[PDB]
Amino acid sequence: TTALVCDNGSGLVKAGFAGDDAPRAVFPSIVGRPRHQGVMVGMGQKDSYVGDEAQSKRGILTLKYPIEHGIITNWDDMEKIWHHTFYNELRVAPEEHPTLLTEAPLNPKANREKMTQIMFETFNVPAMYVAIQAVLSLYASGRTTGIVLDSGDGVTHNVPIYEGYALPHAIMRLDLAGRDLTDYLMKILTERGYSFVTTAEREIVRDIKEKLCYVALDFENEMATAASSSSLEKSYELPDGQVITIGNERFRCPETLFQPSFIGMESAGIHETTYNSIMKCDIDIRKDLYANNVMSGGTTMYPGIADRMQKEITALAPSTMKIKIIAPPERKYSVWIGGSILASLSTFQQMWITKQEYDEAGPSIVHRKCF
Amino acid sequence: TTALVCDNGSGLVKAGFAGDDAPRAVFPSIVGRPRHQGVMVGMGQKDSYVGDEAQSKRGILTLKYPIEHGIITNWDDMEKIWHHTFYNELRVAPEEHPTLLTEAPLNPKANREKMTQIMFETFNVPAMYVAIQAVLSLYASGRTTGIVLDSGDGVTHNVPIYEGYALPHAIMRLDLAGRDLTDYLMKILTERGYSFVTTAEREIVRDIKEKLCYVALDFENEMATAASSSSLEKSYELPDGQVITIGNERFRCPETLFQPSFIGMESAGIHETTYNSIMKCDIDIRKDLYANNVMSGGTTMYPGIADRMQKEITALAPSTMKIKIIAPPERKYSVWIGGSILASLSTFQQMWITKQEYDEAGPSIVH
Amino acid sequence: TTALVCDNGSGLVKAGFAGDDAPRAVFPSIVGRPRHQGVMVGMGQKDSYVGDEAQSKRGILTLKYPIEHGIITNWDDMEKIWHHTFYNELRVAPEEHPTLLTEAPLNPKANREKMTQIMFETFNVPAMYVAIQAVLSLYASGRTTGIVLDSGDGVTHNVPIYEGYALPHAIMRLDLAGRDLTDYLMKILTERGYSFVTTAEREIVRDIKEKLCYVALDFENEMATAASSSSLEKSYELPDGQVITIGNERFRCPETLFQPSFIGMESAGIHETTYNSIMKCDIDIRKDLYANNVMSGGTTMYPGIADRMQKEITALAPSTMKIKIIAPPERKYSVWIGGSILASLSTFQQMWITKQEYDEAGPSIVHRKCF
Numbered sequence A, C: 001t002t003a004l005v006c007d008n009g010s011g012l013v014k015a016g017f018a019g020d021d022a023p024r025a026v027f028p029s030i031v032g033r034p035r036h037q038g039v040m041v042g043m044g045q046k047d048s049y050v051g052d053e054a055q056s057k058r059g060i061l062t063l064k065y066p067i068e069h070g071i072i073t074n075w076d077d078m079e080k081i082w083h084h085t086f087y088n089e090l091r092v093a094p095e096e097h098p099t100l101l102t103e104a105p106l107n108p109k110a111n112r113e114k115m116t117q118i119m120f121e122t123f124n125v126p127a128m129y130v131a132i133q134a135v136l137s138l139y140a141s142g143r144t145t146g147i148v149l150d151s152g153d154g155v156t157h158n159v160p161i162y163e164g165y166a167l168p169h170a171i172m173r174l175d176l177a178g179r180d181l182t183d184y185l186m187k188i189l190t191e192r193g194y195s196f197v198t199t200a201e202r203e204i205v206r207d208i209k210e211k212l213c214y215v216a217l218d219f220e221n222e223m224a225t226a227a228s229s230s231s232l233e234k235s236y237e238l239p240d241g242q243v244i245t246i247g248n249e250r251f252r253c254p255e256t257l258f259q260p261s262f263i264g265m266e267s268a269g270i271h272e273t274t275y276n277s278i279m280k281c282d283i284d285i286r287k288d289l290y291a292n293n294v295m296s297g298g299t300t301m302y303p304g305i306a307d308r309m310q311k312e313i314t315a316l317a318p319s320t321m322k323i324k325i326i327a328p329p330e331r332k333y334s335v336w337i338g339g340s341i342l343a344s345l346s347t348f349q350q351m352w353i354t355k356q357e358y359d360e361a362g363p364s365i366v367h368r369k370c371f
Numbered sequence B: 001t002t003a004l005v006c007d008n009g010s011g012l013v014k015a016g017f018a019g020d021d022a023p024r025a026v027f028p029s030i031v032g033r034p035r036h037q038g039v040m041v042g043m044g045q046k047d048s049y050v051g052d053e054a055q056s057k058r059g060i061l062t063l064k065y066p067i068e069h070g071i072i073t074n075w076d077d078m079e080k081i082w083h084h085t086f087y088n089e090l091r092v093a094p095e096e097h098p099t100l101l102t103e104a105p106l107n108p109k110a111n112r113e114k115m116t117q118i119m120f121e122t123f124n125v126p127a128m129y130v131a132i133q134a135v136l137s138l139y140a141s142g143r144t145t146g147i148v149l150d151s152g153d154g155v156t157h158n159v160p161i162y163e164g165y166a167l168p169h170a171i172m173r174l175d176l177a178g179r180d181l182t183d184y185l186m187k188i189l190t191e192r193g194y195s196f197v198t199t200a201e202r203e204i205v206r207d208i209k210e211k212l213c214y215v216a217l218d219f220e221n222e223m224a225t226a227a228s229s230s231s232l233e234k235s236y237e238l239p240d241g242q243v244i245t246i247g248n249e250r251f252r253c254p255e256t257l258f259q260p261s262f263i264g265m266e267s268a269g270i271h272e273t274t275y276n277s278i279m280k281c282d283i284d285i286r287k288d289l290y291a292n293n294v295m296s297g298g299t300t301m302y303p304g305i306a307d308r309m310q311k312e313i314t315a316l317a318p319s320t321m322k323i324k325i326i327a328p329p330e331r332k333y334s335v336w337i338g339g340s341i342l343a344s345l346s347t348f349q350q351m352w353i354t355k356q357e358y359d360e361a362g363p364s365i366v367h
């Protein structure tokens, strides 16, 4: 009847119906199991917790992430998360609505093939389609020309599009994302005597990073200010009542996006990646790409990131070139909004991979481009 | 037919049937024998007395305790006490009702193995189970999350439980308990000229401690008040008519719980032990543990103990943390009530260690 | 004149002069005070005992450890231990010899800053340097390439080095060490009816663990053998004449190193940690790291630990990979030997942080990388 849009990013599930203005079920992509000693199921105890269930009881659970760097690694956990999303979060029968899914570019084919097999055999979904997140972000922005930088928990990628035409040769992908930033913050916090080693402690540190971290305009001058002044100090209260104080870490943690060498990787910065992606396109396209820079995803929600990137790109680009950074207040749900818009389109109704098409063509039909 | 619940704490036996609201037989765990000269059994004299029998005739008997620090040391006395409980206190045949027993954590395995062997060979009990006292106390409280401090005659232990899941790494055990407090009171009473050296005198001093001792909110200020004023004096009448007067001893005797160094032990206080047990759990659990502090046992019946411990834990805990101490008026029988509740549950009927299971698996099935 | 090398591990002090073949003063890092009732110092009684002084009189003392998990917590005790080491163990004036110190990686900066402040103000040491223990262990081994696992009383850490270049991103640290093993043995011994609750009893249990514990090649089969046979029983005599018998505890106590869940921690085993550290390095380095596995420290002195770890790593590693475990007979003093070798080098004489450098640059000079 009504198509379902479900964005399966790493660490967060956003699902809803096509035509809606926002996803109606948002919860972490985690599975938790008891860790102290064996659970004896002859009586009233459970062994698995999904989403907010694991978050509420994380003090006695070990938390899983089924998706690593945009690749699903634990498929039983994926099936259980899908079942929970389908029967409790949305409490709707899958067999009567087509489902639209999202994936990162340059992923292995086996991931898409397994997703389609599960979506057609375990659940008898009438039809499905897997799209690229950057295209949906551009759809949500309402533009047809621009280069989109999407950064989440596992993957940061750049996709330039010019007036409805993609540029597959200039698509770049980076493995640095929010999870690596959380790990770096956990490592750095040991300098002040704060130790976080468990998965629940990792969730606490992720909350701290979301709440207190920000992007500095100039890193060295900001570091000098933090070394000579204490105006940058912030306080945070732990769940058990302890209070910790954080200083230059607040802007040191997100600095890894522009300086990947902080965690030992040889890659370039996100601004450098965007400039290299733009330079790989034809010379008659670069001006429009400079004029339309779009970010989306949770990792782009740091305060001051847009100004910093505009400064960096202006430094890289020629002086006569005109540049903005487009950072809407709802960058978090841009992929889902674009997916809903696309699923609501009449021209997309021919793109669905139905039951008989998959049954006859086989698994190879996933990489088809109908358009 | 109906399961039997029997809490074998040190110095007190509480037994009854599952589903009942209170134990129906409560008596001291003591065995007494004549002490003056040899009992010649050719005619009408007895040599052993159990429970209230020894208490009534303690003036001509030497009293035993078969259980020391939660460990059974004299097994023949244990068998005789079990036989008396089974045939005179409850006057019921053991071979037709399953029996639920209790034990302190971190006990030797041989104790449980010997208990099971006696409960299966000497008495042909159809099935049995040995549980932890703190879990039964939490069952009686009706909660699934909390940390329980149980203090009796021999053992004080802490067991934190979060929503039906135990935390074995944070279980702490202390050997300071009511018997040590009685010994300390007996030692301290010599300052005023009162001498108690026999077992019956020890029982008298235990009665005095139960009747007159209390926990002070602030020890030094209370001591200053007792030194400068006589409003804290109390009078007690001995069985032979002598009257004794006791002063600061009334709050000095239970102070050993918070200050173990009074009797020469290196351990920390009960509040310090509880705080250390809470700090050993995961950070996402500590708030609920702070909100649910439960005491049970006879040694927690001193007036003012709950306020003192709440003050101490509030001093130890952060200011934003919310704390109560849960001290029901019937903390004495919490373990037995929880055992009865558990034995009445339908999900517990699969937990019984039956005749053939023990006969085949062997002694290792107890754990 | 001659540089001093002092390895301040938890629970043991090893000090000596550079160029020597072994440390000349080895004693526990403990401070003892009387515990029964107040010491009245108007006449001939003492209140503090250091090292073997506390060990000989531990029956009337409560013993301190100033260092917890490689972090100094009681600084007055640290000053007294340093003074004893400097004036009675070595009976040498500090103000004429430079001192080389050791520290665990990923420690708080305040620890090093306080150590330097005490070493420069309380004692007027001409110069000092703080090194990493794993680097000194590799120096003692004589190699330039390899991954070192150092386990002591408080900290177990892994540091991979390839031909003189460190890999800071692959350094891992674990808090499980010998003290936790002693606590676990004390807890487990209650099953047989043996109770140890005081600090002196803890020292006795530590001696028992050092004397009778060993690492089993296969845990379950060894447990079955111990359950079905009594050939694994051992006898130990207490100081007061009591004799105790210990069975499967002898290999259950050190099993916590490979199974941290025995004490309720979520961490992986030491073999798993080493494999994860190796896998984090570049693919062209892993073969040499597999070929050079070095242990050092007291906690690596259990019999059969090297064979067990080689078996585990061979199980984890591919079949074509070549692996040894390097376990010299003197793993206990490897850090001190490497420190002496480094202090004897001519290229290290430029690394000393002298009086005026610290007076001018300030406390921030401790983390400098001169090299």
Ligand SMILES: Nc1ncnc2c1ncn2[C@@H]1O[C@H](COP(=O)(O)OP(=O)(O)O)[C@@H](O)[C@H]1O
Binding pocket: A008, A009, A010, A011, A012, A013, A151, A152, A153, A154, A178, A179, A206, A209, A210, A211, A213, A297, A298, A299, A301, A302, A332
């Ligand atoms: N306000 C914020 N500040 C910093 N980081 C954020 C913020 N909100 C979300 N994040 C980070 O974004 C990451 C991923 O979120 P998102 O990209 O929206 O979903 P997904 O990656 O699952 O598609 C999270 O790991 C989170 O740490």
Ligand SMILES: Nc1ncnc2c1ncn2[C@@H]1O[C@H](COP(=O)(O)OP(=O)(O)O)[C@@H](O)[C@H]1O
Binding pocket: B008, B009, B010, B011, B012, B013, B151, B152, B153, B154, B178, B179, B206, B209, B210, B211, B213, B297, B298, B299, B301, B302, B332
């Ligand atoms: N009102 C009271 N005040 C102080 N102490 C008490 C009181 N009632 C009981 N006790 C002490 O509690 C101790 C043990 O009682 P309890 O814990 O109920 O049984 P058990 O230890 O046998 O399981 C006794 O030694 C007694 O001295």
Ligand SMILES: Nc1ncnc2c1ncn2[C@@H]1O[C@H](COP(=O)(O)OP(=O)(O)O)[C@@H](O)[C@H]1O
Binding pocket: C008, C009, C010, C011, C012, C013, C151, C152, C153, C154, C178, C179, C206, C209, C210, C211, C213, C297, C298, C299, C301, C302, C332
């Ligand atoms: N032969 C041995 N067997 C088992 N453990 C040992 C042995 N020798 C020393 N240890 C343990 O090693 C721990 C720390 O020793 P070490 O690492 O040499 O010094 P430090 O940790 O002070 O630098 C001690 O707690 C001790 O229990």
Ligand SMILES: [Mg+2]
Binding pocket: A009, A133, A151, A152, A297, A298, A335
């Ligand atoms: Mg996303």
Ligand SMILES: [Mg+2]
Binding pocket: B009, B133, B151, B152, B297, B298, B335
């Ligand atoms: Mg009791």
Ligand SMILES: [Mg+2]
Binding pocket: C009, C133, C151, C152, C297, C298, C335
């Ligand atoms: Mg060491």
